[PDB]
Structure formats: structure tokens, C-alpha cells
Amino acid sequence: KCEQPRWASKDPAAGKASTPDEKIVLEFMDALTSNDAAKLIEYFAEDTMYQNMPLPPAYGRDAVEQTLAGLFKVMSIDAVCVFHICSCKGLVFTERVDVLRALPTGKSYNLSILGVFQLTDGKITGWRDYFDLREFEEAVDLPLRGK
């Protein structure tokens, strides 16, 4: 379900990994469609954090794993479409769509996300995704801020 948005950089290189950190993050993006917190957590450092910016952050591998496990109980990531990826000293940015399905309603939405990852020695010390939560809630008829 990976349609280009109109504004995407036309060079296909803009969406491809050209550094070891970009390569790890693209592999991580590939893994997201497993909807499997236990597989995902292997990419993370000990001193780490995760935040979907409209919701509270999680600090440390255990809390990150439990947050993801809880997300996957109410929604599934059916596809991940990465348009732009860039890296520089320890940070990787991804502009993407995650096609998300709300399990209670069966409804899907193409969630526009800009995400940032911090790495050290090939492991994720931070992951933050920025998007508009209300629009997703209304598309899939489900209030997530409560949950």
C-alpha cells in the first residue's frame, strides 16, 4: 500500500540507506510489520527511549517493550512506506507512512510520520515518531488517548 506522496524527493536514493546506521533503521522499519515487540526490542540499547510524540514517553528497554506490546494489542502495522531517510552523527530521520489498522474496528489509515532515531554502536538509544493522533483516531473510529 505504498503510494508516493506528490511531494516526495524524486531521486530514489532519497529513500535508500547509504550508511550503516541508515541500514539498521531500514531493517528495523522492515521488522515493524512483524507487530512483535519481542523481536523489535533486540534493536534497542539499554539506555533507550521511545515516544509517539502525542503520548507519554517510555524509558528503558523494558518499558519500551511493554509500550510496543500494548500498541500491538490494539493496532497492526500492515505496511511501512519509507520515502526519505537521512543520517548524521548518531541520528537517523525517516519520513514515511505506516498503514495502521485498528483491531477493534477493522479500519485502516495511512499515518504520515516523521521519525527520528538515535543510535550508538548500532543499537537504538532513542526513537521518536511525530504525527497527528486525532486524525488517526477519527479515521479508524477509535479513541487512543484513553485506551
Residue ranges that bind a copy of itself, judged by CB under 8 A: 7, 9, 11, 13-14, 18, 49, 51, 53-54, 57, 84, 86-91, 93, 95, 112-116, 118, 126, 128, 130-135, 145
Residue 26 within binding range of ligand HYH, rule CB under 6 A: no
Q: Which of 11, 62, 78, 129 is catalytic?
A: 129
Which of a copy of itself, ligand HYH, none sits in contact with 77, Cβ below 5 to 8 A by type?
A: ligand HYH
Q: Is 98 a catalytic residue?
A: yes
3-state helix, strand, coil in the chain (%, to 5): 30, 35, 35
Residue 77 within binding range of ligand HYH, rule CB under 6 A: yes
Q: Is 129 a catalytic residue?
A: yes
Which of ligand HYH, a copy of itself, none sits in contact with 121, Cβ below 5 to 8 A by type?
A: none
CA-angle at 92, arms to 71 and 138, nearest 5° = 35
Residue 100 within binding range of ligand HYH, rule CB under 6 A: yes
Taking CB under 6 A as the criterion, the residue among 35, 52, 94, 118 binding ligand HYH is 52
Contacts 24+ apart (CB under 8 A), 14-21: 14/83, 14/84, 14/85, 15/82, 15/83, 15/84, 15/85, 16/85, 17/85, 19/87, 20/122, 21/87, 21/90, 21/92, 21/117, 21/119, 21/122
Which of a copy of itself, ligand HYH, none sits in contact with 12, Cβ below 5 to 8 A by type?
A: none
Residues catalogued as catalytic:
98, 129
